[PDB]
Every structure is written in structure tokens, then in C-alpha cells.
């Protein structure tokens, strides 16, 4: 069971947004597909849901007049499209499959009139300076993007352990910036390889770094 | 409907059972449902129907209430379930959601690993310097980190940013980057970041020369 769902986008205030789930793994005509929205402050709020089956939908009041929530069967997919944004829109969106098993890994939106950019990203390289003990730390600097969020992974997800990737800050010039770091044995920096693998949905933008030792 | 959690946010050791409350305006007989949520993470699904628990989770947590009143447990907690809970009704619509418990684990002091790293050339030739300071798995939350330029203490140039409570060891990492101009930069020699924290008996600094 699985729910993939569209990308984080920035859309500018006035606009509309159309977030997709792409179900698999089970019986799509046969479960509730339900939005829920979670906003800063505002909490988890249920925007309304579907039946693929005949298509019989329901929306939060509060959220009738600007979302329609369709699916399409022949391609196990749900749809919810959002008019007339607003800032108070920005928020991660969850589809979720019927309470709620399942729930899809959020589409961040944030409404803004700025423009997407992607990242830059640097080695944090290690030396001498980032070592302690019999361990040394590395990492990857992703610096100067809009809007959240980055996404990075290490080796194509196989080093995990020790990996801390940190919230974001906010620059004085508006732009976002965080750290992915890992601590790993010393004594193996000669031989071991470690790439941040960096993803920017809402540009797109995709890049591998190798991160190699500094003396 | 409204539905009310409390405690906003606990403090508990591993090991200590966990109380969590969930009030609903109405009577919503056991259509009662309880999420756990961790940062950057979708919720997942613990206990529906006030008391059923989802296949998977441990048998460590319970629901139990009826009509109002609905009370999560935790009867041994475990480092893991460090995260948001919520409740949620599902009695007709709109479907409610508690505003969240946070459960926090208290353990004992650990202090910093400390580790600096010098800007990378690539971002030198973009004109800015980048310094960061790392922090690693240390507890409690609480941590004090000074830069000094040529022995300077700066203010005014630097950012932090804490990681969320770690699930496996309940530990915090934390990062102080200070950002500076390539002309600045080159206009001092050493860069040093000092650590200050419960389980250091003396501050640890970690400095470099630009050369």
C-alpha cells in the first residue's frame, strides 16, 4: 500500500493549485481518499474526500466554494484542486486512505509572490577541525533557496545512520538555508565515499555533491 | 465538534508510563482515533475506534474512554516515541483533529561532541564564507556557542538551528553557522567557535586559521 504524492510548489496569492495522490497497492474504488491540510498553527484540518467508486465527494464547510476533490480509477489517482489562494493557504497537504490508515507524505505549498530558486550547495569537507575523538563529521551546506522545503539523502538513501539534517533558517534576505551532517569513523575517510544527494522540488532542482577530505 | 488534548506537552523518562487526554465537546460514542506524528513525517495511525489497536504498533499503547473522555497510555515509554499525538472524531462531519500532546523525553546529560568547519573554496569564489559549528547528540536542549574572530566575540553574523529530540537516543544536535563576506573573512585570521554546556566542566573551543 502506497501513497506518492505531487511535489511542493510555491504559487503566488490569487492563484490555483492542483495537488495529485497517486494510490497503488490496493483496491482504489473501495476506500475513502480524504485531504487534510496541516498549516502553522491552524492544526490538522480536514478539507473533505472521495469515493472512486461513483465519485460521491465531501467537503469541509469552511473549504466549499474553493476545493473540488475528483479521482480518476483508471489511473488510481485523487486530485484536489485549490482557487483563489491566499497566504493562510501555505500549509502541507495530506491525502490519506479510510479514520485515516495510510496517510500520503504531504505536498508543502506555500503561497507567496516570490520567485522559486534553487540551491546551492557546498561540502561541509572534514578535516582535522571536525574531528572528535575516533570520529569525524562531513556534510553538504545547501544554501540560499525559496521556497521550504530541501530534501537531502546521503548515497542514494543508503547512509542513514547519524545523519542529522537540520530545520531550515530563514536569511535576512529571505531565502532559506540548512546543514545535512553525519559523523563516521575516521580512520575510513580514505576509503569510504559519501554524496549528499539534494532534491528542491519546487524548482526541481537536483544535485549530487562529493564530499571529500580536507588536510 | 471540539476536540481538546492536554497536557500541550509532557516531560517523561524511558521507562515511565504516559498519560494523554483527549476531550470532545460531544458525545462521539468510540468514534475516537489517535495519530502519532513526528517532525517532517505523516501522521500514523495508533488506536482506532477509541480502543482498537492498529496492526503493528505496540501492544505499549492503549486507548480507553468512552462518550467524551479518551485517555492514550504509554505504559513503558520508549525513546521512539518521542513525537506529536493527536486525537481525532470521526462521529458524522467535519472530521476533528486535537490541537496535539508533544511527549518529550528527559535523560541523562550528555555533553557535545564540538566540530568547526572552514567555508569551502567553491563557495569563496561566490564571495561569501560560510562557517559552521556543529554540535553533536548532546542533552539537555539548552547549549551556549560564542564565535570569536582573532579573538574577538562577535555578534550580529551567525545562525542557529537545534534538530528535533533524536527517536533513537533522545539526544539534540545543533548547528551555529556565521556568514560572512569574502573581503571580511580575509581580513582575519583565526575563527574559533566556544561551546558552553551542563555537561562540559570546562568550555570547549574549535578554531582554525584561515591559512
Known amino acids: 500500500v502506497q501513497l506518492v504524492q505531487s511535489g511542493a510548489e510555491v504559487k503566488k496569492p490569487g492563484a490555483s493549485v492542483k495537488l495529485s495522490c497517486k494510490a497503488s497497492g490496493y483496491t482504489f474504488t473501495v476506500h475513502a481518499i480524504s485531504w487534510v491540510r496541516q498549516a502553522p498553527g491552524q492544526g490538522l484540518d480536514w478539507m473533505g474526500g472521495?469515493?472512486?467508486?461513483?465519485?460521491?465527494?465531501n467537503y469541509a464547510q469552511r473549504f466549499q466554494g474553493r476545493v473540488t476533490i475528483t479521482a480518476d480509477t483508471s489511473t488510481t489517482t485523487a486530485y484536489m484542486e485549490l482557487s483563489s489562494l491566499r497566504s493562510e493557504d501555505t500549509a502541507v497537504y495530506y491525502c490519506a486512505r479510510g479514520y485515516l490508515d495510510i496517510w500520503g507524505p504531504g505536498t508543502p505549498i506555500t503561497i507567496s509572490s516570490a520567485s522559486t530558486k534553487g540551491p546551492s550547495v557546498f561540502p561541509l569537507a572534514p578535516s582535522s577541525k571536525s574531528t572528535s575523538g575516533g570520529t569525524a563529521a562531513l556534510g553538504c551546506l545547501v544554501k540560499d533557496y525559496f521556497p521550504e522545503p530541501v530534501t537531502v539523502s546521503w548515497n542514494s538513501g543508503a547512509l542513514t545512520s547519524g545523519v542529522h539534517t537540520f530545520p531550515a533558517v530563514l536569511q535576512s534576505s529571505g531565502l532559506y538555508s540548512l546543514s545535512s551532517v553525519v559523523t563516521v569513523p575516521s580512520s575510513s575517510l580514505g576509503t569510504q565515499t559519501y554524496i549528499c544527494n539534494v532534491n528542491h522540488k519546487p524548482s526541481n532542482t537536483k544535485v549530487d555533491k562529493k564530499v571529500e577530505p580536507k588536510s | 465538534i471540539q476536540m481538546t488534548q492536554s497536557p500541550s506537552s509532557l516531560s517523561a523518562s524511558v521507562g515511565d508510563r504516559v498519560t494523554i487526554t483527549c476531550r470532545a465537546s460531544?458525545?462521539?460514542?468510540?468514534?475516537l482515533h489517535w495519530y502519532q506524528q513526528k517532525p517532517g513525517k505523516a501522521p500514523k495511525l495508533l488506536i482506532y475506534?477509541?480502543?482498537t489497536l492498529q496492526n503493528g504498533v505496540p501492544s505499549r499503547f492503549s486507548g480507553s474512554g468512552s462518550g467524551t473522555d479518551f485517555t492514550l497510555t504509554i505504559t513503558s515509554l520508549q525513546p521512539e516515541d518521542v513525537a506529536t499525538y493527536y486525537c481525532?472524531?470521526?462521529?458524522?462531519?467535519?472530521?476533528?483533529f486535537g490541537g496535539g500532546t508533544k511527549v518529550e523525553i528527559k535523560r541523562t546529560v550528555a555533553a557535545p561532541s564540538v566540530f568547526i568547519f572552514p567555508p569551502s573554496d567553491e563557495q569563496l569564489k561566490s564571495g561569501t564564507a560560510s562557517v559552521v559549528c556543529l554540535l553533536n547528540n548532546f542533552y539537555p536542549r539548552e547549549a551556549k556557542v560564542q564565535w570569536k574572530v582573532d579573538n574577538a566575540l562577535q555578534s550580529g553574523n551567525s545562525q542557529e538551528s537545534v534538530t528535533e529530540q533524536d527517536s533513537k537516543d533522545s539526544t539534540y544536535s545543533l548547528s551555529s553557522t556565521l556568514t560572512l563576506s569574502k573581503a571580511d573573512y580575509e581580513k582575519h585570521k583565526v575563527y574559533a567557535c566556544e561551546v558552553t554546556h551542563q555537561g562540559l566542566s570546562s568550555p570547549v573551543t574549535k578554531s582554525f586559521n584561515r591559512g
Open positions: 460531544e458525545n462521539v460514542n468510540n468514534c
Open positions: 481525532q472524531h470521526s462521529y458524522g462531519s467535519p472530521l476533528t
Open positions: 475506534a477509541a480502543f
Open positions: 472521495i469515493i472512486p467508486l461513483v465519485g460521491m465527494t
